[PDB]
Amino acid sequence: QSHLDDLFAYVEERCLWQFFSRTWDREENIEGVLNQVGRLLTGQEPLRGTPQERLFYADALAMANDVRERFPWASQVNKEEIEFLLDGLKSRLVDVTITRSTNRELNHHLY
Amino acid sequence: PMVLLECDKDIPERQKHIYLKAPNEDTREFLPIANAATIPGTLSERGCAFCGAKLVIGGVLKDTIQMIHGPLGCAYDTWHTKRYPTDNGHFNMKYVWSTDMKESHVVFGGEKRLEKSMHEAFDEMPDIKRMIVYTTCPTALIGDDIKAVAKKVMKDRPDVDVFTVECPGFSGVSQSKGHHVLNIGWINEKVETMEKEITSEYTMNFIGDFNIQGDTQLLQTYWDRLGIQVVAHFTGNGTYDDLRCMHQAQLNVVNCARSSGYIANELKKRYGIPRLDIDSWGFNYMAEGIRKICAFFGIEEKGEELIAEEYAKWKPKLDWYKERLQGKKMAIWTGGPRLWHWTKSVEDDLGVQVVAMSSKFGHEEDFEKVIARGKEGTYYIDDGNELEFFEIIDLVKPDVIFTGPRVGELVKKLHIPYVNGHGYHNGPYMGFEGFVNLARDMYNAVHNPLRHLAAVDIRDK
Amino acid sequence: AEVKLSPRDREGIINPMYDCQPAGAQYAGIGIKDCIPLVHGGQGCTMFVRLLFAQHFKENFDVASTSLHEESAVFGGAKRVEEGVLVLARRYPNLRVIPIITTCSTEVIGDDIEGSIRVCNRALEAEFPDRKIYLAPVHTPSFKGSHVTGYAECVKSVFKTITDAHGKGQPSGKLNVFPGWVNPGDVVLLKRYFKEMDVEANIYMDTEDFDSPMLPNKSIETHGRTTVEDIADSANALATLSLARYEGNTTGELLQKTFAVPNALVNTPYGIKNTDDMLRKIAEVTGKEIPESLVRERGIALDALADLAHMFFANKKVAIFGHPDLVLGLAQFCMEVELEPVLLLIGDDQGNKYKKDPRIEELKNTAHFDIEIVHNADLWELEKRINAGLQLDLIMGHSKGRYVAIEANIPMVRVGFPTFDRAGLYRKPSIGYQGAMELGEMIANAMFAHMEYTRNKEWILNTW
Numbered sequence A: 001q002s003h004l005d006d007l008f009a010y011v012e013e014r015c016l017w018q019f020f021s022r023t024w025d026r027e028e029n030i031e032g033v034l035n036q037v038g039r040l041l042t043g044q045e046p047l048r049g050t051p052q053e054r055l056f057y058a059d060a061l062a063m064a065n066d067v068r069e070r071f072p073w074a075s076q077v078n079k080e081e082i083e084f085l086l087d088g089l090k091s092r093l094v095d096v097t098i099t100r101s102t103n104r105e106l107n108h109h110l111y
Numbered sequence B: 001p002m003v004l005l006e007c008d009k010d011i012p013e014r015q016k017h018i019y020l021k022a023p024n025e026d027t028r029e030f031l032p033i034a035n036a037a038t039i040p041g042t043l044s045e046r047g048c049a050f051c052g053a054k055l056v057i058g059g060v061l062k063d064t065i066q067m068i069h070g071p072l073g074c075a076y077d078t079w080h081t082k083r084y085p086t087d088n089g090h091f092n093m094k095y096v097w098s099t100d101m102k103e104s105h106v107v108f109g110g111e112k113r114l115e116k117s118m119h120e121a122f123d124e125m126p127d128i129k130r131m132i133v134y135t136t137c138p139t140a141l142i143g144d145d146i147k148a149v150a151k152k153v154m155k156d157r158p159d160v161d162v163f164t165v166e167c168p169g170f171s172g173v174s175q176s177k178g179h180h181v182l183n184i185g186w187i188n189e190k191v192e193t194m195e196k197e198i199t200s201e202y203t204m205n206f207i208g209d210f211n212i213q214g215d216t217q218l219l220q221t222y223w224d225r226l227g228i229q230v231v232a233h234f235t236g237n238g239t240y241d242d243l244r245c246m247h248q249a250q251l252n253v254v255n256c257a258r259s260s261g262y263i264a265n266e267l268k269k270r271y272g273i274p275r276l277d278i279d280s281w282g283f284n285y286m287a288e289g290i291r292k293i294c295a296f297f298g299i300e301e302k303g304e305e306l307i308a309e310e311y312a313k314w315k316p317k318l319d320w321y322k323e324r325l326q327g328k329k330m331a332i333w334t335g336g337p338r339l340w341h342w343t344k345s346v347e348d349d350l351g352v353q354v355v356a357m358s359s360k361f362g363h364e365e366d367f368e369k370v371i372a373r374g375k376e377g378t379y380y381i382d383d384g385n386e387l388e389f390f391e392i393i394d395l396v397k398p399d400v401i402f403t404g405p406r407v408g409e410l411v412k413k414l415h416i417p418y419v420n421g422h423g424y425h426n427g428p429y430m431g432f433e434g435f436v437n438l439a440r441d442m443y444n445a446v447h448n449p450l451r452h453l454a455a456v457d458i459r460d461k
Numbered sequence C: 001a002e003v004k005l006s007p008r009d010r011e012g013i014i015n016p017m018y019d020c021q022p023a024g025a026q027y028a029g030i031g032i033k034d035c036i037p038l039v040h041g042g043q044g045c046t047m048f049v050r051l052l053f054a055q056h057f058k059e060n061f062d063v064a065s066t067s068l069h070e071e072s073a074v075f076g077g078a079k080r081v082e083e084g085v086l087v088l089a090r091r092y093p094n095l096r097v098i099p100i101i102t103t104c105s106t107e108v109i110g111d112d113i114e115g116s117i118r119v120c121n122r123a124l125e126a127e128f129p130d131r132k133i134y135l136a137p138v139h140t141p142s143f144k145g146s147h148v149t150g151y152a153e154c155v156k157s158v159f160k161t162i163t164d165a166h167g168k169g170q171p172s173g174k175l176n177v178f179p180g181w182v183n184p185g186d187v188v189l190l191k192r193y194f195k196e197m198d199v200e201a202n203i204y205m206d207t208e209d210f211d212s213p214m215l216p217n218k219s220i221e222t223h224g225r226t227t228v229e230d231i232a233d234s235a236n237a238l239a240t241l242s243l244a245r246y247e248g249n250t251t252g253e254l255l256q257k258t259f260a261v262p263n264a265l266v267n268t269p270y271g272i273k274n275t276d277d278m279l280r281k282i283a284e285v286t287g288k289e290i291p292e293s294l295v296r297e298r299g300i301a302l303d304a305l306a307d308l309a310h311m312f313f314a315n316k317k318v319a320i321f322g323h324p325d326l327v328l329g330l331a332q333f334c335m336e337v338e339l340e341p342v343l344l345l346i347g348d349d350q351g352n353k354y355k356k357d358p359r360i361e362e363l364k365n366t367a368h369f370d371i372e373i374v375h376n377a378d379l380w381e382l383e384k385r386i387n388a389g390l391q392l393d394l395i396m397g398h399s400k401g402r403y404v405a406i407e408a409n410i411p412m413v414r415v416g417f418p419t420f421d422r423a424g425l426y427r428k429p430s431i432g433y434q435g436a437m438e439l440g441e442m443i444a445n446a447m448f449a450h451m452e453y454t455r456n457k458e459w460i461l462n463t464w
């Protein structure tokens, strides 16, 4: 299994942020958390300027720590690979939690 | 694949509610329909919308009259049935209030009967200054305007504050609608109607925890150690007026995203308060939650000290239970969220394999979560009914079932022990210590001489 | 001695004594073999009552809902009833009886239950030509009466339905017995008394097997034992013995009117005199003698009670709450053993009946002290009287009053329904001679423990 398979399987089994109540919140979280994961895994400073950024950092830090613990490759891998991988992971999470989810509430404007 | 159980051959519409996860499937093709109408006559486990408002959320509050506008049964039925202690002598469990609707009220209206009952309740208990009024089936049907009545009482009694909920039992399909109506009404009417002193640089609400057997009070030991002020608990060991101040918090930490995600989502939209979803059951999950909370606030090292202390205190006992529970098969037949909070945590921390799960009222979102975290070969059931439970037992042969007491008492006849997945056996079950308590009860349930004795027929040589 | 009746002075209720009518109709139905009640209304009306039964008995009982939702609440629920009947029959091949129990919601919206039964009968005769399913309309609006009245209504409707279908035939030689709303242990006792007297009887409903075993073969035996055939045979009885004015006597009256089965209503058999009088009436109607074994059980009870009455019970003030037959009967028992039942609370709107109960005059002629009987009472009325200074030595009532006694530090004996906060009470008789003995010993043991915990002459429990 590929590196991207390992990331996807980890997110699906562990994380909750991709399963928020509505499409817009899932989109916001998939983008926000994974951008922070990419900073963390390539040794860049995370964004911590706004409350929302600081939440994305909190969720991303767990993920980044767990992937470095679980997967040998995740230490001993590139930068341009985090980019490739996170682009793929975003697309895969949007596909399974949004595009092809049959959860009928996802586009309800009203909470 | 989806499963048509034998007992459902005459209600074949149930197939779309039951998923058996199999290898290589794209689970997006197999998500159970959830939160749909109940089939009459099935012995579904479901309850009503009023339950979701009064019993589950509003009634947890320590300092509030729970005025049920309806005939007396709805009140009787929601009294002596919950285990949510408080630190004020359990006022919330000791009392229930009814407007004792009679036929004349059905015919000519119940608004004056409600007004009088409200005054009475305030007069009887002059130290109590807060109330929630709930509609029930017949007071909804006749169109009583409980908001109007509450506004008049408030004008006549400037010492009180009253909130109203329209939640007849036939609304929605289950208790879920009661959660929704209460959440949305509270944020629209009562949030931002008061403020409290802020005493910490770190503030949060804790959203969707109802203090079952003291869960909230146990978690509070963590927040106090970390120096985090909880502006409001929604609603475990809570007060009415704390809930009025929820807009003040820096962070909303959510456990029960089913009952209480609504208000977290509206607090984010209206006030910008971020929503953090955690798991406050599970040992390793509890650590992850504390680490996320501490990362948000910039107090990582404090969180690590707490976690290290709690691991040293409780991890050895957890591991003792793991050695003994490894491989045991569990079913979880509860409301919904505990399926996705527990399937992987009991697997990770206790070695226990959850073989069947049923959700009374969960939404498709709850099924997304549980199937993501759950095992292959497990049954995932939306709106399960009694005969299905028997068939599932035959299929998966659980060693222990986490469910309510009445179902526990049923499966005892089949020699299957239970733990009360709702109100607990010997809780609390949240947090580090709480998962040990869960494990202990599971162990005692299964490691039980009575089960073996019951199988012996003394007439056999 | 003045016995004063008064109503609750509040419109609202705080801490209701009883549940609503549908709950009692469910209790009546679960005592019938091959019966699953169908409660027409919202889901809570079913599920909360299944929980209540699990609290009292620590068992599951099968009751189904029609699952009224918003559509049906606006446009009518007849299709929910009709579907629910069919779903039941399809999935439970051995089902024979379905009391269709109305709720506040379906009474307000005016669903026509009898019409839905015609529809269902046609559908069931077509789909299941070899089965017979009895559908009984049970009208139980919750905005009248209480679970006491709903139990009585459900028994009456099920008996009307089944006996309408079968009519009168061969005399059976048996008594019909309506004990009312009692525990399995009470039914066990009555069965023993009829057996020792050589009197054949059906007890309606026969709930003995609610206390079901955990068996090697994993079978489930938690069912009512009263069958269709038993119920039908009530038209053929020698006589009806009705023990409870408010919990089945109206069925005995219906069988008298319809089938000329003479009904004998007696005082509910709590205490010695009431049990004597029940056995006298049994002897009179059957021509059978009371056996020596019952004189002996009586004597054993009296011996036990005599060890307690003047020593521990005399002059002690008691409050009693529960079903009206139980409250009135326990007050009579209490006076036999020198207790003083000064406050009796009865929990529903039936005060015009209770004022005419002959036991009120019986209590007036035997009381050495004033009695207050509060009708339409809630349990706040008890708590508020204690808060105002009423000094009680004992409370007798069901478990939903427990916090009143715990907080006031008053010993309390658990009687009536539900008794969830002690173990095994459903198996212990309260009626009859054995039951009087068992009640008296529970009272003494509760006082004894209280003397210990409070250090109140705890040294005296040595040579009594």
Ligand code: CLF
Pocket (backbone or CB within 6 Å): B048, B049, B050, B051, B070, B071, B072, B073, B074, B075, B077, B135, B136, B137, B138, B167, B168, B169, B170, C020, C021, C022, C041, C042, C043, C044, C045, C046, C048, C102, C103, C104, C105, C142
């Ligand atoms: S579904 Fe829920 S519990 Fe049911 S009535 Fe409706 S709000 Fe209430 Fe109430 S008084 Fe009794 S229990 Fe019912 S029949 Fe009415």
Ligand SMILES: [Mg+2]
Pocket (backbone or CB within 6 Å): A009, A012, A013, B372
């Ligand atoms: Mg996976």
Ligand SMILES: [Mg+2]
Pocket (backbone or CB within 6 Å): C303, C304
């Ligand atoms: Mg003796």
Ligand SMILES: [S]
Pocket (backbone or CB within 6 Å): B045, B046, B047, B048, B174, B175, B176, B360, B361
């Ligand atoms: S529910």
Ligand SMILES: [Zn+2]
Pocket (backbone or CB within 6 Å): B447
């Ligand atoms: Zn052992």
